[PDB]
Amino acid sequence: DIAHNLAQVRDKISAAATRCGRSPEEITLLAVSKTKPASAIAEAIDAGQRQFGENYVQEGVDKIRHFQELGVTGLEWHFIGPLQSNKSRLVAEHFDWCHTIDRLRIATRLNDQRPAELPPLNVLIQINISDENSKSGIQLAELDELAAAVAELPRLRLRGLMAIPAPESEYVRQFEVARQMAVAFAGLKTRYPHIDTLSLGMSDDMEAAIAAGSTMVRIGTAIFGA
Ligand SMILES: *Cc1c(COP(=O)(O)O)cnc(C)c1O
């Protein structure tokens, strides 16, 4: 039951926030609906969920159109998969957020392809904080430079950072890696305007991520099923 699952996940987020002295409202639940049908997203919407994350462009855009045409309003769609230049127009025309900016050229493409009547596309810079097996994300040493360049693009709005840490079973290392991201996030916050989003944490490291300073957790299977 998606409604029951959503409630359970929200309770876990709230508990984790309250335990470490944070307000539950500080944490956004991003429901990750990749590979799940529109009907499952519709159940989540009926249960009050408004923020959805998609990883594949055409799948995501088809869903966005489906709910637009149904006359559902108030939804927020986040693109959280790797972006390729040949699919960027679709992201720029339909999504509200993109978490996966890891090079300047793709940001400039999105900027140039974003219609002026839409709000600026909210973007996060993706850091490869700990994953030797991933080619997504920049090194922290490259952040100052990329952030400055992306920040000038008028049809984007730089809102913070994202990371997908390497899988980690130890809580200590979950927390330590998440803190590296929180420190970088805090640093950006001190000089850049409207830095308020740290997209960090999934089901298995949710508590460590929240304790470290995440503002947004990305949950799929625990809401929608395997
Ligand atoms: C798939 C995915 C998730 C959700 O993972 P689950 O195992 O289904 O909870 C979260 N964030 C990103 C970027 C993903 O690709």
UniProtKB/Swiss-Prot annotation:
The modification N6-(pyridoxal phosphate)lysine is found at residue 34. GO terms for molecular function: pyridoxal phosphate binding. Disruption phenotype: During the stationary phase, the deletion mutant exhibits a completely different intracellular pool of amino acids and produces a significant amount of L-valine in the culture medium. The log-phase mutant displays slightly decreased coenzyme A levels, accumulates 2-ketobutyrate, 2-aminobutyrate, and, to a lesser extent, L-valine. Also exhibits an increase in the levels of isoleucine and valine metabolic enzymes. The mutant also accumulates gamma-L-glutamyl-L-2-aminobutyryl-glycine (ophthalmic acid). It comes from the Bacteria. One of its GO terms (cellular component) is cytoplasm. CDD domains: PLPDE_III_Yggs_like. Keywords: Pyridoxal phosphate. The keyword Cytoplasm does not apply. Pfam families: Ala_racemase_N. The keyword Iron does not apply. PROSITE patterns: UPF0001. PANTHER family: PROLINE SYNTHETASE CO-TRANSCRIBED BACTERIAL HOMOLOG PROTEIN, PYRIDOXAL PHOSPHATE HOMEOSTASIS PROTEIN. NCBIfam families: YggS family pyridoxal phosphate-dependent enzyme. Monomer. Belongs to the pyridoxal phosphate-binding protein YggS/PROSC family. Pyridoxal 5'-phosphate (PLP)-binding protein, which is involved in PLP homeostasis. May have a carrier function to deliver PLP to the target enzymes or a protective function so that PLP does not inactivate essential lysines in proteins. Does not have amino acid racemase activity. This is Pyridoxal phosphate homeostasis protein. The gene is yggS.
